[PDB]
């Protein structure tokens, strides 16, 4: 009952402007199907579509519980719904995957690398997945990657899809108040409406009043993701939760979303992938032939202009304007990372998390031993010119020893840390009476020895 009393929704009560089609209004619905305020004159009413979705067909039977929320709501009210009503802990990582709304197909082992590589990173960090909701394009690759692993939904995979309410097929079938509404994995090819992804877990249906049109979720998702980043993480050392942005393909619009993330306080690192095409491939080709970031010569500039006007089929002035936004992204070339095939996107996502953390390197090392990932440490935490505090490497070595991390001990031996200077009587004693690690039979033997001693 708290869902209906706290969150709102809006319905299309307009003057029905015809524009193109006589049946299609400004909101695109049928003329007799009715029942922002500019040209739509919408009214505010309490929500009538919340509860749980039972997915019939489409593989495994899975429940993805949902709520229809007005697009102008404050994200503070929504975060209380995740934490209290939906019993979700605060994530240790937020990732937000964007891309093209059009369906596409990539390389088959690019689909394998994206398959295992994402869902391993979500498992090791306990992360939240933020997609576009509907089962088109990049999100169709997301749910297919969830078909690869599935399994531990109890380990908080949490693929929350944020989609507009207007384009999800069978809207009247999904009307209920805390009631299990059965939903089909049938998607009609004749209908322009597209269905939700079948293997999600939570849904933020954002109604702006209109139907069949996008843009009802972009402003809500950006304000929500900022709102999570202001929440202090459970380590409570002075940092919020990390946020990274995963980019595959995309159109000319997603380039502006990159500049929105980069020109932001705090800055959000992005990661791109190669081989999908379109906006991801032009951002990749910008990165390798870049020199000093925005310092791009004329011949490579014209090669970028002709590839924009060919792949995105734009004009000369539209390609030049997209090149301006690409140069504005180029200024912050350090924040972006590029994944190239030929190894997974685990290392790319976690490297971008390291770059966007901007914390102390002993804290990065402690996060690395928590992650059990050695290669991330050897390629990022031992950076060229990394400041090392006096004794912090010794504490990291001690934690690696008591945590049973043999490869990390190999790393700290490889990068300094004299074994003679490390040892102290109290150090060996405090690593002799540690409880973290495997099962210890030393207690019983030391009890028997102290008993037989006297």
């Amino acid at each position: 009952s708290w869902i209906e009393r706290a969150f709102y929704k809006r319905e299309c009560v307009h003057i029905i402007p015809s524009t193109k089609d006589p049946h299609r209004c400004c909101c695109g619905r049928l003329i007799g199907q009715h029942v922002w305020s500019i040209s739509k004159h919408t009214q505010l009413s309490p929500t009538d579509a919340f509860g749980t979705i039972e997915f019939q067909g489409g593989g495994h039977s899975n429940k993805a519980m949902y709520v229809r929320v007005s697009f102008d709501t404050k994200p503070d009210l929504l975060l209380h719904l995740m934490t209290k009503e939906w019993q979700l802990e605060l994530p240790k990582l937020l990732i937000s995957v964007h891309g093209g709304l059009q369906n596409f197909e990539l390389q088959p082992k690019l689909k394998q690398v994206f398959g295992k590589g994402l869902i391993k990173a979500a498992m090791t960090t306990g992360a939240w997945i933020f997609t576009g909701g509907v089962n088109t394009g990049v999100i169709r690759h997301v749910g297919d990657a969830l078909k690869d692993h599935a399994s531990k939904s109890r380990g908080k995979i949490c693929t929350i899809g944020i989609a507009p309410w207007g384009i999800v097929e069978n809207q009247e079938d999904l009307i209920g108040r805390d009631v299990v509404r059965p939903y089909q994995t049938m998607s009609n090819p004749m209908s322009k409406l597209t269905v939700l992804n079948s293997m999600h877990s939570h849904f933020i249906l954002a109604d702006n009043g209109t139907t069949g049109k996008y843009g009802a979720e972009v402003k809500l998702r950006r304000q929500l993701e900022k709102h999570i980043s202001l929440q202090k993480i459970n380590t409570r050392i002075g940092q919020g939760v990390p946020v990274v942005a995963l980019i595959v393909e995309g159109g000319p619009n997603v380039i502006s979303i990159v500049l929105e993330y980069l020109r932001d306080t705090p800055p959000v690192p992005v990661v791109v992938c190669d081989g999908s095409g379109r906006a991801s491939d032009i951002l990749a080709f910008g990165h390798k032939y870049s020199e000093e970031g925005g310092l791009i010569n004329e011949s490579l500039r014209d090669q970028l202009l002709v590839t924009i006007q060919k792949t995105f089929t734009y004009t000369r002035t539209q390609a030049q304007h997209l090149f301006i936004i690409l140069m504005e992204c180029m200024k912050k070339k350090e924040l972006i990372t590029v994944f190239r095939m030929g190894q997974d996107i685990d290392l790319a996502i976690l490297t971008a998390l390291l770059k966007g953390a901007n914390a102390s390197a002993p804290d990065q090392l402690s996060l690395a031993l928590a992650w059990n990932r050695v290669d991330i440490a050897r390629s990022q935490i031992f950076i060229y010119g990394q400041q090392w505090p006096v004794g912090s490497l010794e504490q990291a070595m001690l934690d690696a020893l008591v945590l049973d991390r043999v490869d990390f001990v190999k790393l700290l031996i490889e990068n300094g840390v004299s074994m003679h200077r490390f040892l102290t009587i109290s150090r060996l004693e405090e690593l002799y009476n540690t409880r973290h690690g495997p099962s210890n039979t030393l207690y019983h033997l030391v009890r028997d020895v102290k008993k037989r001693e006297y």
Partner: peptide, 30 residues
Amino acid sequence: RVENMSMRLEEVNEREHSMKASLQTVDIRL
């Protein structure tokens, strides 16, 4: 190695098809 060989031969044969299209378009114009 035959897993990456098969993937790259799928890409190389597609690129050879694009090579055939480009060569036919070049030969048509001259």
